[model samples]
Target: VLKIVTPMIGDKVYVHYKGKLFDSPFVFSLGKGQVIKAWDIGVATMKRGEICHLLCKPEYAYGSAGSLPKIPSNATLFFEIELLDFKGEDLFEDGGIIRRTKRKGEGYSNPNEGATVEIHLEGRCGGRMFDCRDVAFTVGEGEDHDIPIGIDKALEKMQREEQCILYLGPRYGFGEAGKPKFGIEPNAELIYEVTLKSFEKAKESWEMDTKEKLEQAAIVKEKGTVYFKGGKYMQAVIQYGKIVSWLEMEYGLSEKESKASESFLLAAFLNLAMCYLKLREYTKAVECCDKALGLDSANEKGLYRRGEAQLLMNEFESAKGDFEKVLEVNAARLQISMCQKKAKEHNERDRRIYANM
Candidate 1:
C-alpha cells in the first residue's frame, strides 16, 4: 500500500529501481514520457520511499517490439520499485527559488509561457499571512498580472490539478525592499503554496522571434484561407489580422526585409483585403491593398484587389487607373475588363440618381 502523496506528470522526481530481465539497479526521472508507460503509472502511484512490485503486461511494458537482448516483444515484465523525493522543475539552487510538491496532479504536461493559468495560492512571510485566494493570470504578462515571478515559474512546471509549495528569495519576490502595500516586511522571504487549476494557451505575439513568428504566420494564413473559402469573412479577417499585427508590431522589417517575412506579410495583407472586400468594407479593403502595394508597388494582386474596392466605392477613374496597372503586370486582363465594365454601369447609375435629385 502507498502512503503520503504520489508523483504526477511534469513533476521532476527520481526513482530507485531494479529491472528483473536486465537485473540492474537504475535511477530515472519519473514523468514527461521519460520512461516506459507501466513504470510511469506504477511509480506515480507510489508514496515516497514506498516499495512495491508490479506485474506489467506487454501493452504497459514493451509491446510487439521490445528492448533487444533483454525485454522481449509482448513480454510480461516484473518490477520492484521505490519512489524518491519529488520537486517541480522550477526549483533553483543557491538561494534563488526552491519548490516542494504538495500534491500530485493528473496528466503529463505543464503550461508554457503565455498560457492563461487558473490557480489557488496563499502567500506568507515570517509566518504571517499576506495574501490567500484564487487567482488567474497569464504567464509572462508582466506586472499587471496577479502572479509574481517566482510563483509564475513554479506554475510553469506544474501539471493541471497539481499543488506545490514554493520558496522565493529576494531576487524573485519582493526583493530587498518588500512591498509595503501588501504588508510584506523589508527583505522578507516569501513562501507560497500554489495549486494549478487549469490553463489555456494564449496568443504570445511579442514573445516570438522572427523565425517563430514566420512559422506561426504560415499557420494563421492557412487557417484564414480556409475561413475565406468557407464564406466566413469575419473569421478570416481575424486570422489574417493576427499575422499583420505580429509582423508590424513584433517583427518589424529586418535590415534587408528577408524574403520569408516580406512574402508572409504581403500575403497576409492581400488576404485581409479580400476578406474586407467580402465583408463589404471597401475602405478597409482599400487600405489593406495600399499596404501591400507599398511593400511591392507592382504587385498585380494588390492592384487588382484595390481596383475592385475602388470600383465598389464609385471611384471610377481611380479604379480604371488601378485596372491599367494590373494589365501592365500581364495579369488579370479578363477580370479587370469585367470590373471596368461594371464600373461604367455604376458610374452611369450614380449620374442618373444625382440628376433625378
Candidate 2:
C-alpha cells in the first residue's frame, strides 16, 4: 500500500531493503545515484511507506561486471524494499525551504529581495489554520514584524499576480520552539499559500556600471525632451531627474567613467534648467544653469537661461554679462539688447539727476 507523495530528485530518501542473493539487509537514500541505478529508478516511482519487489537485470544493476563471487556476471537480482521517511530538496542555499507554484502569472519580473511585495498569505500547521491575511512586507527582511523566511523565498520566485505554495521546515519557520502567538506546536512544519499581488523596488534608480548607466541616461534624456515638448513640465522634470541622479552617483568612479558620464550630466542639468524655467521656479532654474556651466563653461543655453533668470531678479549687470558672452550664438539677441538698453538709460538718468543735486 502507498501513502504520502513521491520523492523528487535530490530528496534524501530512507529505505530498508534486503537483496535476494546479497544475504544482507541495508538502508540507503534513493535517487541520489548513490545506490544501484535500478533502485534509484524504481524508488522514484514509489510512495512513502510503500513496500515493493523489483526484478533488476544486470544492465540496470551492476552491468556485465557484477559483484564477483557473490553475484555472477549478467545476473538477474530481486529485492524487497520499504520506504521509510524522506526530506525534500532545499530550495535555497540556506536549505529547509520548498516552493511549488499553484498558478502562474502574467509577467517575467520577480520582485527584488529588499522590495516591498503585496501578497495574500494563508499559513497552516498540522492541518490547522494559524494565520491568514492580505499583507505587504519587504522580501528577505526577517524581522518579527516581517513575513516568515519561507514566504520570502517563495516570493523571490514569484511575479506580479502569481500564486504559489511553500513548505517550511522548523528551521525556516518558528524553529523547534514554535510561536505560541500563532498556535504552532513545538517542531511544527508550516505550509503557506501565497499570492503575489504587486511589488515596488526599494530603490527606483538604475543601479549599474558606468557604461550601462550612460545608455539608460540617454534613453531618459530623450523621454524628458519629449515630455517637455508636450507641455508636461512635471513629467519632464521627473524624466530628467532620473539621469541627473544616475550621473551624480558617479562621484567615486574612475577618470574614464567620469569622463564618459560628463556629457550626460551636462545635458541633464541644462535640460532640467529649462524645465524649471518653464515651471517658474527661477531659483532652481539658475542653480541648474550653474551646474551646466560648471561642466561646459561656454555652453550657450546655460548662459542664456542664467541671463533670463538674473534679468527677472532685476540684476541687470549680471544678466547683461551673461547675454553679451553668448551674443554670437544667441539668434534672438534683440530681446537681450532691449533689456540692456533699458539698463543703460536708467543708469544715465540717475547720473543726470545726481549732477543736478
Candidate 3:
C-alpha cells in the first residue's frame, strides 16, 4: 500500500518521487497545481510534522494509459514524499483581534479584561500598512456589556501571552463587501495573527476614573494650550479632533470602565461641542453641546458651547439662554465677551436670512 498525506491549498512543499512501474521518475513540479489528483489531494490535507500513506490502484493512481510510457493501466503506485516546510499567511483580523474568540486559560490570546491595554501594532494588508504605536487603550468596565458576545467570551478565556490566528470571513473582517480603500477584497478571507500583549490587574473603578482624569489633563496640556493660543479658530478645530478621538475610543473600551469614567467622558464631549461651534459646524456643535448638557446639566462648557453653536446656526433666542448660562459660570472673560458679540451677530444674520423667507 502507498501512503500519502494531504497539504493545504496554499502551502509550499517540495518532493521527489518515482512510480512503482517505472525505472525512474524524472519530472518535477514545484509546489504548484500541476500535480495529479492523488498528489493534489495528499498535499491539501497534510500538516507540517505528519506522515501519511495513500494506497492507489491503477484507476485511482494513473488511470488508463498513465501519462504516456511512465506507467500502464494495471499498475499500483507508491509515492514517498517529505515536506520540508509550508508557507501560509498571517493576515490581520477586522479591527483588533483581541475581541473575536473565546480562549479558556490566561493565555496571551486575549486582551487584559477590565485593564488598560496599550499596544504598538503594525498592520499589513495586501502590501498596505496601517500602524499605531503605544496607543493607550483600556477595556473599561461597563463597556464589556457592549462588546460583541464572541469577543467578550474570547477575552475571558484567554491567558496572558498566548497567541492565536483568527479568520474573519468577509462579513466579520471588513463589512459584507470589505473595505475597498484598504484593499480587502469582497468576500475574501481575513486572518489575524494575534498575541495578547498584557493582562494587567484590573483596577478599581475609582482608580480608573483617576487615571482617565489624569490623561485628560495631559491632553489639555499637550495640545490644548498651543492650539488655544493660536486663536479660537484653530483651537476649536484641534480640540474637536481630540474630543472625537477620545469619544470613539471611550466607546471601544469595555462598558463597565466607560461608565466609571463618566467625568472624563463629559469633559471630552463638552470640549468637542465647543470646538465644533468655533469651527462653524453649527448643527453638530449644537447636537453635541446638547448631549453634553444632558449628561451634566451643570457643565459650564456645555452651556457655553450650546449658545455659541446656536448663535452660529442663527438661533438667537437659544443663543441668548446659552450665553446667560455661561456668564453664570464665569462672567469676566473673553469667552463671555465672544458670546455676546456672536449673539448680536446672530440677531443681524437672523434678520438677513429670515427676511422675506
Candidate 4:
C-alpha cells in the first residue's frame, strides 16, 4: 500500500529534529513557509512515525544567505529528523484551526460528510476547561449543535477511536461573537480535546428502490469525480465503490432504469480500475476493467487499462490480446517482442538443465 498517511500541504507538523537537531522538538505547518524549502519538501514525503535523514544541498538549505552566527556560505547541511505526530488539516487554509494528535486513530478510514458520529470532548479557553460533554451528532447538521464549526470539519479527517487537541481561531470557533459568559472573550481562541468514540454511516440509498438509488448514485458520482481531480484517490474509491454496490445487483428493471444503471455502473467501474492502477493494485485493476468491459464489449479505455494492468503483472501474452483489441499498436507490438524474447530464454534454460542432467 502507498504511504497515504504522510502529511499533506498545510497540515500542522510536530517533529523532533537535529541540526536540524536540538534538545527541543519543533512545530511547523507543513509547506506554509514556516521552515526551509528542504523541510517542506522533505517532511511532505515522510510517514507518520518515520525517522529520516535528509541531505540538503546549499540551494535547499540557507543557500547564499547564511545564518549570522552559524557559519559558512553555500554550505551543505545534514539533518536527522523524527516525525513526532501530525494531524490537523487547514479546513480554511488560513491556519484558522490547527492541532496535533493527542491519541492516534485506530484505522485508515473516515466517515463521510453526512454520517452520524459519537464523540467525547473537553473545551478549553483561557486556561480554563469551560465545557465538557459527549455528543451524538450528524456531521452536516451544524445548525443544531452549540458545538463549534471547527470540530465538525476536523471530524472528517479523524479515524474511529481517534483523539486530538484542536485549537481554533475566532473565525472558526465563535466567529466575531465569542460567548463571554461561557468564559470566552470576543474573538477568543479555544482548545478542544476531542475524541471520536464511534460512528454510523448514512444509508447509501442503494437500500432504497431504483429511483432513489439513481439519485444517490448521481450525487456520489459527482463527489467521486471531484475527489479524483483533487488527487484523493482513496476518497474517490469509496464514492465510486458505492455506485457499484448500488447498481451491480439489479438484474431486472424498466429499460430506461436498466440503461441508467448500466451507464452509472460503467463509469464507476472504469474509475475504480483507474484508482487501482494509481495504487499499483494491478490485479484489482484488471478485475475492475474486466467488469467494465463486460458491460460494453468494445470499450477502448476498459481494454487499454486492462492491458496496462496485465503488463504490470508481467502477464505479457494476456496484455497482448487486450492491447490488440484496442489497436494500441505500440503496447501490443512491445509485448509481442517481449513474449518472443521470453520464449527464446525459456528454451535456452531448458537446454542448460538437460545439458547438466
Candidate 5:
C-alpha cells in the first residue's frame, strides 16, 4: 500500500511510470498526476520534504474499467515517482506593481509609486457570475483600502515567486448585494489566487509573520498545549479523539485573546493536558497550567485544571489554593460551581483509589 501523508490536492511532481497488462507493457507517463486515480493517491502520500517510490496494482491501481488503448482492461501500473516539492502559489505576481514611466499604471516595481492597474474581472458569487475588476485608481502606498481588501493585502505583502489563496467577503470584493451581475451573485465569497513575480520593498514582513506562526505552532506541538506563566488550564477541547490544527493557533495568543478568539488556546491546552496527564507527567501539566493562567489571571477554568495537576503531584495544599482562586476570579459561579463539584468528585475518587493501596 502506498503510504499517504499529505493533504489531497493538486501538487507538482516529477515521475517515470510503466504500465503493463497480461504481461504486455503498453504506456508510460513522465510527469506527475498524469495517470488516473493512482497518481492522485500516490502523489498525495509523498511528503512535502521527501521523495518516495510508489507501486500501484490494478485493483487499487486500475480495476476492470481502464482507459482504452493506453491502459488495458486489467492492467497493473508501476510508477517510480519522485515527489519533490509542494506549495501554494499566488496569482498576482509582484502584486502587479508597475512603474508609472513604463505605462502610467504598470511599472518595474510598486506600481511606479503612484499608479494603479485596472482589471475587468468576472466575479462569481452564490451561484452566479458577474463582471467586475474594472475599477481603477492610483495606489498611493496606503490606498489599498479603496480596492478589494484581498488584492490590497496581496499587493501589500507580495514578493517574487510568492503566491497565496485569499478568501474575500462580499463587502471586501463586491458590495453588500454584490456588483450588478453582468452575469454575479450578490452575497458570494470570492476566492483569489495571487502570485507575486516582482516587488520593490522586499523585506521580511510576510516571511516573519509566517515564521512566527510556524514557531508558535511548534511550541504548541512540543507540549501539545499552548500556555503562559500562570498556573491554569483552559477546560475545553476543539477536537476529541483527533489531531486538531486550527484550534492550536491559540498557542500564540494570550489567554484573554484566546478567549476572545473563541478560546482556541483553551481547546489546544485541554486536549494536550489530557494527553500528558494520562502519561503521569504532573510537573509538565503544572507548567502548562501556569502558562495558561499567565494568559488570564482571572481564568477560573485554568485554575481549576491546575488544581488537578497539583493533586496528581500530591500537593493537596497547592490544589486547594488553585481551587480557591478559581472560585474567587470566577464570580459568574458557572465554571466556579462546576469546578467545585469536579473537585469534590476528584477528591472522593482519589481517596478511594489511594485508600485501597
Candidate 6:
C-alpha cells in the first residue's frame, strides 16, 4: 500500500494546527513567523501527513505577554500540527528550469551528488515527443546519459519514485548549438516528464585507485566529447576538467595504458583550450594550449589555438610568431594578415592617444 502526497501542495506548507486557544482547528503556513516561534522552528521539519506535537514554552510562545482570555502570562502551550503543502525551487535560474512535481515519493533522502540513478523519462518539445525511455547516469555527471541539464538539477531534490514535469528553457536543454544528430532543434524549449526510480551513492576521488582514476577519466572524456559535439561547451569544460583531475599525476602503467594516458591528457588539454576559446575565457584558452603544447611541441592544433587566443588578447606579435610555427596553410596565412592589420590599427590608436595627451 502506498500513500503518495499530491504535488499540488508545492511549497506552501499548510498545517492544520491545534492549541488550547483556537475554536476551529486552523490552517497556517509553516514558515514566515505566522505561527508561534515554536511552531515555526519545529513544524518545519515535518513531511506531509507526518504528525507533530510540540511543547512550546513561554519563551517560544507569547512569552510574558499572552493574548487575553486566549492565553495567560508564562503559559506553556502544546501544539498539534500536521503538514499540508508553494514557490517553485529554481534548478537553474538562468535557464529557467521549473520542476513541478507530479507525485510525491517515499521517504526524505535524495541521491548524493555522484550517486548513480535509474529513471524513466519522456521529453517533448513544442508538443512534439522527442524522447521516451528508461535512463541512468551519475547524478552530477548529467550528460553521461544524454539527459539535459534540467534533469540533473531536478534529480538532486527528488526522492525515489518521485515524478516531476520539468520545464527547460534552451539554456538547460541543448542550448544554442542543439543536438542535431539526435533530432533536437536549436534553442528548443522542452518538457520532460520524469520518474526517479532508484539510486545508490558512489565512490570518492580519495577512495579511487590509479587504475580506477584512469578508467573514470576515460569515460568522462567521452562525455566531454559528447557535450562538445552537442555545443554545450561549458558542460564539456566541466567534463574535461574532471578528466584532468583524475589523470593529473602519479601514473605509469605498462605499454598501451601509459601511452593511452598521455594521449588522453593531450586531448584533455586541447579540448579544454577549444572550449575555453569558445567560452571566451581567452587566458584559460592560452593556458590549456600551452599545456597541450608541453605534451607535444609543434602540435598543430595547439599552436593554432594559442595563436587564436593571442590574437583575441591583442598580442599581434606573439600571435604572429605562433602562427609562423604552424608553418602551413590558409588559416595561418589569414590569421597572420589579420594580426598585422590589427596591430597597425592598435599602433595608430596608441599614437592618437599620445598625440591627444
Highest TM-score among the candidates is held by which one?
A: 6
- Clashes in model 2: which pairs? none
Candidate 2 all-Cα RMSD: 20.8
Query: Which residue runs of candidate 6 sit more than 4 Å off their true CA positions?
Result: 1-87, 100-115, 126-134, 137-146, 156-161, 177-185, 218-239, 249-263, 276-284, 293-300, 313-333, 343-357
Lowest lDDT block of 10, candidate 1: 1-10
Clashing pairs for predicted structure model 6, backbone only: 11-86, 12-85, 12-86
Candidate 3 lDDT by residue in tens digits, 52-144: 566666665667777666676676777665554554322233333322222223533445344555333333445455322334444432121
The clash number for model 1 is 0
Name the better of 1 and 5 by TM-score. Answer: 1
Candidate 5: C-alpha lDDT? 0.47
Model 3 regions more than 4 Å off: 1-122, 128-192, 206-269, 275-300, 308-320, 323-357
lDDT of each structure?
0.76, 0.75, 0.52, 0.78, 0.47, 0.78
Give each model a TM-score.
Answer: 0.44, 0.40, 0.31, 0.45, 0.26, 0.59
TM-score (C-alpha) between model 6 and the true structure: 0.59
Q: Provide the lDDT at 268 for model 5.
A: 49
Q: C-alpha displacement of 97 in model 1, angstroms?
A: 3.7
TM-score of 4: 0.45
Lowest lDDT 10-mer window, candidate 6? 1-10
In terms of lDDT, the poorest run of 10 residues in model 3 is 141-150
Q: Per-residue CA lDDT of candidate 1, range 102-199, in tens? A: 66787777876557888888988888888898888866442344445677666677788888788888767865546777888666778888899998
Model 6 lDDT tens row, 130-243: 789998887767766678877877787888998888888887787776777668889888899999999986665667877787888888889889979877787888789776
Cα displacement (angstroms), candidate 5, residue 48, comes to: 24
